[PDB]
Copies of this chain bind each other. A is one copy, B any other.
Amino acid sequence: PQVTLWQRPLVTIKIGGQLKEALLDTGADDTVLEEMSLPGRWKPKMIGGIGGFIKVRQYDQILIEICGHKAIGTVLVGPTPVNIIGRNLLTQIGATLNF
């Protein structure tokens, strides 16, 4: 759908059998979810933002269903304040930014 930016663009994602709300974030390269349980294996990694780095777990081939749209990607799971859907997934749902 089209979304304005007066409110922050949140959508509902289904991941790991769990339903969450997440930010659609053009500025984020990767998707970063707060701590939750996935099954399977992961790897450590650090990402950066404002403030600095966080260490995160990298899970590959995770199916996310964003709004209704299935997508399979890597998600990072860690101490983010907010769940973030980032460009690696935005591309798969076809998101565009218009101005």
Binding site for B on A (CB under 8 A): 1-6, 8-9, 23-29, 32, 47-54, 67, 69, 80-82, 84, 87, 90-91, 93-99
Q: Which of B52, B54, B80, B96 contacts A97 (CB 8 A)?
A: B96
The answer, among B5, B24, B50, for a CB contact under 8 Å with A81, is B50
Judge whether A8 and B27 touch: CB under 8 Å.
Answer: yes
**Chain A interface mostly:** loop
Decide if A23 touches B27 in the complex (CB within 8 Å).
yes
A90 contacts B5, CB within 8 Å? yes
**B99→A95 contact, CB < 8 A:** yes
Let me know if B52 and A4 touch, CB within 8 A: no
